[PDB]
Amino acid sequence: DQVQDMYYLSPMQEGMLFHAILNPGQSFYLEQITMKVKGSLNIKCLEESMNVIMDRYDVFRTVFIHEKVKRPVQVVLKKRQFQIEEIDLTHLTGSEQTAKINEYKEQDKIRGFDLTRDIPMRAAIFKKAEESFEWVTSVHHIILDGWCIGIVVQDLFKVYNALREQKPYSLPPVKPYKDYIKWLEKQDKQASLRYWREYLEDFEGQTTFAEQRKKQKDGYEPKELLFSLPEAETKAFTELAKSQHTTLSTALQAVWSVLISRYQQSGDLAFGTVVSGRPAEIKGVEHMVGLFINVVPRRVKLSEGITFNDLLKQLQEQSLQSEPHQYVPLYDIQSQADQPKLIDHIIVFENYPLQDENGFDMVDVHVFEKSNYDLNLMASPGDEMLIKLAYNENVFDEAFILRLKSQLLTAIQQLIQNPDQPVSTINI
């Protein structure tokens, strides 16, 4: 009587559940969002607003069963009451407060979620002063990928603002995540594996930036280099992508391909790309909340004389052909190449980052996610395109990451100016 529905997991959900169970305490698939709040936040109203969201999106009411079943299932419960943990730190010094919040975050990363019982999202709000809070939200990506949180946040603050202004509100209908599970039933899984097998046919593997990789200190030492593409170049880069009927994300991947081709002295190269995973065939798939995005390999072939606009065309065409097959987990993709480390770095172009009316201001919005690659090129749109190189400094020197920034900037400039010359003529 408490169960609304039950259905199988997507292949990607199944993979996450498998590794989540096998690796407790390691922060797998956990996203931690920290918002510093200055103003008259009403936590009771925020909690009421979040419970409307719980009712709206089935994934928040979902738990998972793996024991004593032939195959894992996800169970949608009819009603789950969400509670924000309120913690009063107003009796502590600023130093004591920061230590308490860091303590919470580190224990929360280790705690993770019991996916057979917990709501796979939690929130704690720390009161530091009268109108001063820190809001830490944790979520598991088996119910909600990182590009979905903006959808939920928009709904959350529409409801909050309506209750604050004491006026009626509505939210538009949304299709249930089960509709995506139903679409997966109609897909030929062996045909999708064959797509990836043929795409990666005869690829010889690649250690990216092999001559720059250190092998000394143990573990991951996370560092980042942030920089912006100047406005004039950003405008021209955007106009170029549009004029070739492609996206900024594809254009950035094309620039990176040129850079990698030089370091690898090769015209056959690969890197990971985060793809949307939302099949256009599915009605209103744009507005669904759940797990969709995936890291898939991009394999780029640079022939003699190939131009930037040629590359844009190559990549844009492959994006379209890959769309029906983006649900295949990378483990299964890379098994079709007999190459467990086919890719070793990724490009992530996030159109609406969380980092980038309510009675309060949000400041220093920060997102934590476990890093799985020693190098990550991350970009987001803006008047100046935002670019971040997030890397493992135990593997790559800061000076090398600074060189990559320099080369990326001059490559973008040169490719904008001569998109119809061979990319081999660019100087890096």
> How does strand 30-39 pair with strand 360-369?
antiparallel
Are the beta carbons of 287 and 155 closer than 8 angstroms?
no
Whether residue 221 sits in one domain with residue 78: no
Determine how β-strand 3-8 pairs with β-strand 73-77: antiparallel
CATH number at residue 373: 3.30.559.30
**Are 215 and 160 in a shared domain?**
no
Do 161 and 199 share a domain, yes or no?
A: no
The answer as to whether 366 is a domain residue is yes
Quick check: 96 and 123 in contact, CB under 8 A? no
Residue whose entry in the numeric block shows the structure tokens 């997102």: 367
Q: What is the DSSP string of 4-62?
A: EEEEEPPHHHHHHHHHHHHSTTS-TTEEEEEEEEEE---HHHHHHHHHHHHHH-GGGGE
Which of 253, 215, 263, 281 has its CA nearest to residue 349? 253
132-140 β-sheet, strand order: 85-88, 121-129, 132-140, 30-39, 360-369
| Same domain, residue pair 167 and 277 | no
Which range marks the domain in which residue 81 is found? 3-172
**Distance of CA 21 to CAs 6, 65, 111, 114, Å?**
20, 11, 13, 9
Residues 102 and 211 in one domain: no
Beta strand spans in 70-131 (E):
73-77, 85-88, 121-129
List Cα–Cα distances, 56 to 2, 62, 143, 284, in angstroms.
Answer: 17, 12, 14, 15
| 217 part of a folded domain | yes
Q: How far apart are CA 66 and CA 142, in angstroms?
A: 14
Classify residue 180: in a domain, yes or no. no
Q: Which of 367, 375, 325 is nearest to 345 (CA)?
A: 375
Give DSSP secondary structure letters for 336-405. TTT-TTS---EEEE-SS-S----SEEEEEEEEEE---SSEEEEEE-SSS-EEEEEEETTTS-HHHHHHHH
Contact yes or no for 312/251 (Cβ under 8 A): yes
Residue where one domain finishes, among candidates 114, 137, 172: 172
Helix, strand, coil % over all residues of the chain, rounded to 5:
40, 25, 40
CATH number, domain with residue 88: 3.30.559.10
Tokens linked to 252: 């950035």
Take residue 268 and report the two structure tokens written for it.
Answer: 């056959």
Distance in angstroms (rounded) separating the CA atoms of residues 428 and 408? 8
Residue 175 near residue 283, CB atoms below 8 Å: yes
**378 and 334: one domain?**
yes
Whether residues 134 and 63 share a domain: the answer is: yes
Angle between helices 248-263 and 231-243 (to 10 degrees): 100
What is the C-alpha separation between 46 and 96, in angstroms, rounded? 26
**SS3 category, 77:** strand
